[PDB]
Amino acid sequence: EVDQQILLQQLKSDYRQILLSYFTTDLKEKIDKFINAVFCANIPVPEIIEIHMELIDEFSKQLRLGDLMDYRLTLIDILAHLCEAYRGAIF
């Protein structure tokens, strides 16, 4: 187990699956698990935002088309859940 990239790549993989199933019908568990992992690893929000953008770039290439602006809903949903995880813990 070399370093941080081991987890950051797994998280990117997990987030990819959330994006691809976001506008479908079960998803809740995938999001809850992703949130708990970034929460437990103290991953900064800018890193999550970077994963989002990277996957958007990958998607745009696979689709032969960087804001896929509808996926901003997904990011909002993720950040809102992360905020609440942290807020529910502070006190």
Q: What is the CA radius of gyration of the chain?
A: 13
Experimental approach was X-ray
Q: Answer whether 48's CB lies under 8 Å from 76's CB.
A: no
Sequence-distant (6+) residues with CB within 8 A of 91 are none
Question: Tell me, what CATH number does 68's domain have?
Answer: 1.10.1240.30
Into how many domains does the chain fold?
1
Segment (H or E) for 65: none
SS3 content of the chain, % helix, strand, coil (to 5): 75, 0, 25
Residue 55 domain boundaries: 1-91
Segment (H or E) for 86: helix 72-90
Q: Answer whether 18's CB lies under 8 Å from 78's CB.
A: yes
The length of the chain, given as a count of residues? 91
Q: Answer whether 60's CB lies under 8 Å from 68's CB.
A: yes
Helices (H), 1-91: 5-21, 28-40, 45-62, 72-90
- Cα gap 38→26, rounded to integer Å: 21
- Tell how far CA 41 is from the center of its chain: 14
Residue 63: C-alpha distances to residues 12, 40, 78, 80, 91 (Å): 19, 34, 24, 28, 45
10 Å Cβ neighbour count for 17? 13
- Cα gap 86→21, rounded to integer Å: 25
Which amino acid appears at position 30 of this protein?
K
